[PDB]
Amino acid sequence: SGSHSMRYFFTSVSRPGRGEPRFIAVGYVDDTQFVRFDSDAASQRMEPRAPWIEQEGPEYWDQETRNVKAQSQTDRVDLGTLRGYYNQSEAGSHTIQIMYGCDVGSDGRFLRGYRQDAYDGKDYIALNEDLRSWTAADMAAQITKRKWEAAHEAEQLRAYLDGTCVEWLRRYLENGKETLQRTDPPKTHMTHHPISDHEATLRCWALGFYPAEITLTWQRDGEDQTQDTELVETRPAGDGTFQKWAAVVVPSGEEQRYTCHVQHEGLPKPLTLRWELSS
Amino acid sequence: AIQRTPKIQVYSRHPAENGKSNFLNCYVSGFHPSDIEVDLLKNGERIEKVEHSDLSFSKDWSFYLLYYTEFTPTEKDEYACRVNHVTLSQPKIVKWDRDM
Amino acid sequence: TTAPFLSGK
8 A cells, every 4th residue: 555566567579570679668667757768769778767767876877778688689589489489480479578566565575576578469478476386377488487497597587676676666756755745636527418318328537646547446335247347448548547447338317326436545434426417 | 470560659748738748658558560650641641840759560460660759739630640561461550539 | 775686587
């Protein structure tokens, strides 16, 4: 509830006979982007995306550039290797995705570390919660799991996920404490849109909230509506805040039967919204 | 191998008030593979000077992107988002609807 | 900061 996270996301996309793969890396503290690398950008450097990281010195940018450029060269090999494992041709575009990070509690103590890899939009291999073993998703990926077990990659990575990652997360949170400790609860409201003379869409809104996790439910007379609810995916406002809505189509005159329940870390009490007609 | 169709949302950063500057958002998510074309449109015509977020992805591995640009709403002007992806027969246009 | 490289898959 006062817990935080540091995550890096990598995507490598092979370009058949058109040069090197498109590589894009992003790091995040909670839901705030703070670094970026894009193999097609001008700088060819890891670049800052949050003011509180701008402060880091030229050796920090030098080391993050070298490590992220390397990560992409190891993703470029892996695309060729995984093409071999899944017996695919050299003609098609393929994708590797990687995500890794750690979480701390409100007092800065390690909670969790993770690393998850994917090939063409499906699970390939992931590190287990214990941080000392792997789970492969199929028999191709079990080959990777044997290399990494041989080289004891889990134990080097554990030292980062439960050590280095936690110390740098704790620093970024201290260095960025203006930006990062702010929780914004949702500004909620309800709108009403007749479909016809006899029905209308009720839409329950949640606006300007941070961080992105939220729940929106529709109850009719205290019973859930999970089947007739239209839910949209949570979305960025573009100012660092998030938005979502949910809708139910209801018979005209029955609006006051329906409730929209809103849950967010910021909110003291879960909000209950009702469309109340004239008095 | 697996192909997933974009979910397209078109909306303003702040609630729309005629004459006051704002940002126009096109959020595309749930898609695979990552190659995608997104254009914001005013009255049927492409807007240049349109920015986007850095490619990231969700827990299910599907991609998401935010395209945005500064604008001022007016009753007369009509805004849309135009998306092309391998999963779509033709480019999908979604219209900016003021309640959003 | 980014994590140290893993060896090839």
